[PDB]
Symmetry: D4
Subunit: 199 residues, 8 copies
């Protein structure tokens, strides 16, 4: 089941959960040039909500309420980007987050391939652009967009098990705590700079 909406959620039903999987689609990698076009959400129950964002849209009160609720962990893959584009679009930076890309880099030390496809293949044996600004999204587009959020909860559970096993929970927690500010630094103009590097 994939529910497609225009502009905002109708309500926050099905989203009283403790953690929500979140992803975005845009016109590109540069938030100042490339607008947010689609937002995907999942409660982890095997269904997803796909929300089409209009050009110039500045507000999405129910969605933004969800994004701002500190009692709900937002799960991303490479949240550095999604946090940046979400904050740029709606003016709210989430501050309770989990990133599967950071978790992979902290746990899957036996590989250099940390993409979502490879992670899903290794951990779950699950097999995972286009004009996202189109007025009407195709069925293939909607199914692809939903596929990016359907599995993030299971990955979070496995990565939390691995982080506990290798005793890296506080490292991951500190990285996730800093991640929203890393995204803010990207938005402010340091996107090409490792702020902690010697040069």
């Amino acid at each position: 089941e994939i529910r497609v909406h225009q502009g905002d959620l109708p309500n926050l039903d099905n989203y009283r959960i403790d953690a929500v999987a979140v992803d975005t689609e845009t016109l590109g990698l540069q938030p100042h040039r490339d607008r947010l076009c689609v937002v995907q959400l999942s409660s982890g129950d095997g269904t997803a909500d796909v929300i089409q964002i209009a050009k110039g849209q500045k507000s999405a009160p129910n969605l933004v309420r969800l994004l701002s609720d500190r009692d709900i962990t937002k799960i991303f893959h490479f949240g550095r980007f999604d946090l940046a584009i979400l904050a740029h679009t709606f003016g709210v930076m989430p501050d309770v987050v989990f990133c599967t890309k950071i978790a992979s880099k902290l746990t899957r030390t036996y590989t250099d391939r940390h993409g979502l496809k490879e992670i899903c293949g290794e951990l779950l044996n699950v097999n995972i652009s286009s004009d996202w600004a189109a007025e009407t999204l195709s069925r293939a587009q909607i199914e692809y967009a939903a596929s990016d959020v359907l599995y993030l909860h299971r990955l979070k559970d496995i990565f939390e098990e691995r982080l506990k096993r290798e005793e890296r929970e506080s490292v991951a927690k500190a990285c996730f705590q800093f991640l929203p500010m890393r995204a803010n630094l990207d938005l402010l103009g340091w996107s090409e700079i490792d702020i902690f590097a010697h040069s």
Copy 2:
């Protein structure tokens, strides 16, 4: 005035201050191979303390008490390294820090030269290896080691003025808050990895 000590401070006098400038010298850039040899401290009063650390020394209770005191800000230049070597040597990671290198990268956006010599030259018009494991340090070594801490307070004051002026105080605060964990990540084996990069 440069006070040279063996092993530890005799007491914590002159160090009831709100912020202390800290620097280290080692046998190299790799904390697991290159031992800490000298630690420099200054209260900002134009004097410095230079503490020679012995091979295999595991404890320095007065120094470590200072390093652990959360009411005293530790000022570094490129604290990413000093925090790592200090934590590796004495087992205590400072958690209240200020880094002039991060501050320069956040404020001196008109240059790509962020070294201490260039910073001192631009901001203060002040003009700033060897076998640091020698049993007896030379006078030139002692004076050079002291010169690296004598000016960090004045730099911190100027950088705080610039951070306030450009409205980047919360960004800098979050970077400084994460810096000890960046150093821990370096110590654990991710020293060559930008943990937030896409690849």
Copy 3:
């Protein structure tokens, strides 16, 4: 229908249109060394004309009349090259042009693949060397040469829709206006120089 000609068009029939798709084939990427061998034209009606150019040929009055007519937009893919080789061969630089490669770089910001095959695949679901100096071209050569012009009109229509949608029409217009001079700069000896770069 692919009409193959020797030297020049017999007349300008079927070419009273408002825009003509144009492409070339040569012996290589260097106009001073690698001669123009074939020119392809299409009115957009699903047919193409393929004109074999002889070695040392200096004139093609009907073709050059078409190329010089300011009331007819010449459509290219990467016109920077075709304009250069056409001007070098016949002495006339077109000044009313549309380039699908520039348009892709101005609109398909969600990808780094701007080749004609990828563009045709994404926008139209259409699936797209050899001795072009041969006295007799093979049937496969003729069909391949025609395939490069059969779809440029449909691409121009879609790219114009996207340029209007993202409000970049005046940017594209200025780029297309400068493109003939970019080709002239290439012909004069600056082909390896970004004339606008700092270094």
Copy 4:
């Protein structure tokens, strides 16, 4: 004589001239992050005006009137940057410009050093950062800022002689005509992209 102003010119006297030398200073190379701090102007009479721009200043009617006057050529060195920062700050893009950096690249083909210092050294035997946001600029800062505009007229005269001599006037004219749109492309987010390159 160097006249220092706050905010704007008092009037447009001394600036009825046919061409004006223009330069800027900023907090860095990124117009979205690094604000315009100082603007320098010269009529070519050996004097200069140095205008300090306040943080958040949105208007400078006399200056902007000068920048918008199509009967006055604006002379820059590497105008790609200055045009971008000026348009970003005051909302007006000059469209009658001359760039000594483009002219050097089109005429000084016997060297790969096109900086202003090298140009002034070769063509005139004339011998040519800091916190430009300071409330009070130092005398050294003011003299340095003025030195960047005092010689652009003489360079323009020599470069025009060379462009006429080598018969490249129409090439240069077309490059200068496109330069404001190159700056606009930079402002819109393509600053790292050669829009005319194959890849």
Copy 5:
């Protein structure tokens, strides 16, 4: 036949042989961060022993007795790594070794592909990650781990024939004699340094 053990060999039966094939699996390429998880052994009789090593395990007396026995040649592929991780884990550096990777580099001079898969393909026509820290290894994991040791004896025989044929036996012997110290240098912190290079 693949025998899977927990912690150590039950005894040293089947291992009175003159040469033993040895391989390891770990959590990654960095012995200080990535623990040894599995050790594979073979006597060359077409069977293998797969020994799961527990987290924090410091001793394996029967295995370590085998590793320390100077009358038994230990065969590795790229022993530089395995020797390092074995010495780091159990405190014993083997000093009688044969490395098929060094042998390939000394004999297969007609190729630049020296991986085990390519070697097995060329010399034997034999056709050759995952969470190796899992409490229970899968059947696929066990079979893959065994496949890495089943063929090293046959490769050693062929490489010894080639080394004799091309008269490079003393070169190979000296390289193998130095290899344990190369591994020690890696363990001590010079893993990224060619100690014999000019720079």
Copy 6:
């Protein structure tokens, strides 16, 4: 028909021809380290001779007589290597040569792929390591070795047609005349140096 010989030709029959296709196989790319193992010859009649060269063999009088005969053009693909290894092994440098790799670089200007497989594919629609020091070559080895010489005559004919067509015959002739000295320069120690480059 592939005739396999030990040491030398039995006689020079079938080799009164005006041009002979020649190729070699070795233990690698470095003539001082990697010995010549096999020589292949063809008269162009669709048959080939494959001559196994013994370790330490210094003479092959019939073969060397053929290689030295100035009335017979030796055809190579990338003769720079074959000439070097032949001269190093038998002490005779051929001085009447044709190289299909140079010819391709002088004629196939529309591609950057100049390997023998690609050349045979484009020009002829013909579809084209191992231990070459083995005492007995396999049937697959013999057939592969023969396949490298069976087509060089047809390529030479086509390349000569193209060189005549594009009026580059004297350029190619001078390149072929210099090629033996290029090979000698390689043998003397300048194999990594473009002797004509500025740096």
Copy 7:
């Protein structure tokens, strides 16, 4: 003594010599764009002739007679360039040449610095751009231009001694024999291609 001429030599006096030192100056490194502006000649008697070449000049009969005379060796430093520009300007390619840059690369194997300044410094202890198209050359320009030819004879003598000493005379002779064709290849469009390289 430096004799400055317009267009051509008045006669060929002082130039009955067996070898002449030759150099050129141009507007740049690209013969198709950057015209020949000055030619320098010396008989080796410590004097030089400096001939200003006019824009568009196609003939210089006395100079070209000298350049074409096969009984007179033309000495260059990096003749690859000078031969190309001379042949492009006057239509005559010298075929009896000596190049000090090739000679240095064949003899000064103990250094990687083969520029004329370094050669003159090492071999002779002699201590060695601008608008060369100026109607009137300055005295400094004339003296600099002459300094580039005053020493080539002495260098040729020393390099010939070294080539004889190291037994590389026939190698150098073959390189010099090919050099005019290397220059022709540059003129034809292969200036960026090592025609003898594998790739």
Copy 8:
């Protein structure tokens, strides 16, 4: 005192010492092309012997006796090269060696500059090409050649102190033991290959 000899030592007087400093000069970095021209020796008493080696010289019995004597340690700086050229010239590979470059890389971990000049500057405050094949060496050449051996004993003493201090004596000993075979590998054709690297 610098004693200059032709061909060989007259006798082995002054060389009953326990360690001898050794250096060479050649025509370049490639032993197969660039012959040994000069050998320098010192007993450590502040004097040196400089032995000119003739072209084609195959024997130097007194020198080679010294080089072969296992009771005398040969001290080099970057002995990898000197050992190679000595073995290539005289057929004897020393097997008791000390290398100051390896020692620096094992002890001076606080710098990346390991050249002899920098080492002498740091450790001793001592301040440290040409045609070495000249029949008569100049006084400057002789003094420079001697300066390269006059200080190696003092460096060896200091490096041995540092190796003892940091407990790396057995590492250094194993590296020095392998160094002659590293030089042999260079001579055999692996000079560009790190034989222990993964790729």
